């Protein structure tokens, strides 16, 4: 004797959805460098000309001090800097009871103007206070040493009158 009935229902549903966000990246690139090659002389002719009549002109755009050796007083300027740079052959530190001691660096920068070179960057000068911007005011003729009349030196003898030796030349 049977009348058994067990119906089981089955439902179906399918949730379909999709959200996939990703992000695209990017990177930066910047490579740069530089060298120096202003001095160029494959010939070694021992005289302040090298191979071109240039060095006279540099000192010519500069003041009549010529510093002393003729090696220094080079007239150059940088591009990015736009500050003029005078090349001194070697770093000379000159000290005497004059004041104390003065440091003349090689590649010094400053505001060069026809007549006077104002505000340097490399020449630490102590005449009374130690300052690295004490500059050389010249009247395109007479010179007033780096400080501004604080040290009285006559252009007459060799331009700038102090006993220093830029240790690059003998």
75 exposure class (CB count in 10 Å sphere: 0-12, 13-18, 19+): middle
97 exposure class (CB count in 10 Å sphere: 0-12, 13-18, 19+): exposed
Q: Which residues are within 8 A (CB) of 26 and not within 5 positions of it... i.e. 6 or more apart?
A: none
- CATH no., domain 32-170: 2.30.240.10
Name the 3-class secondary structure at 157: helix
Q: Which pair of tokens denotes residue 73?
A: 């007083």
Experimental method: NMR
What is the C-alpha separation between 54 and 34, in angstroms, rounded?
24
**Could you say which DSSP state residue 137 is in?**
E
What is the C-alpha separation between 137 and 146, in angstroms, rounded?
7
């Amino acid at each position: 004797s049977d009348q058994i009935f067990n119906k089981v229902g089955s439902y179906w549903l399918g949730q379909k959805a999709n959200k996939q966000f990703d992000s695209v990246g990017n990177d930066l690139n910047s490579v740069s460098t530089s060298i120096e090659g202003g001095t160029k002389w494959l010939v070694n002719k021992i005289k302040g000309k090298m191979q071109k009549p240039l060095p006279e002109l540099l000192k010519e755009y500069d003041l009549p001090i010529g510093i002393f050796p003729g090696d220094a007083t080079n007239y150059e300027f940088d591009e990015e800097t736009k500050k003029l740079t005078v090349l001194i052959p070697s770093i000379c530190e000159v000290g005497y009871k004059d004041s104390s001691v003065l440091k003349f660096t090689t590649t010094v920068t400053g505001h060069l103007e026809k007549g006077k070179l104002t505000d340097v960057e490399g020449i630490k000068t102590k005449v009374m206070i130690w300052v690295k911007v004490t500059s050389i005011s010249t009247d395109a003729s007479k010179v007033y040493f780096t400080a501004g009349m604080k040290k009285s030196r006559s252009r007459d003898a060799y331009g700038v009158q102090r006993n220093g030796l830029r240790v690059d030349k003998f």
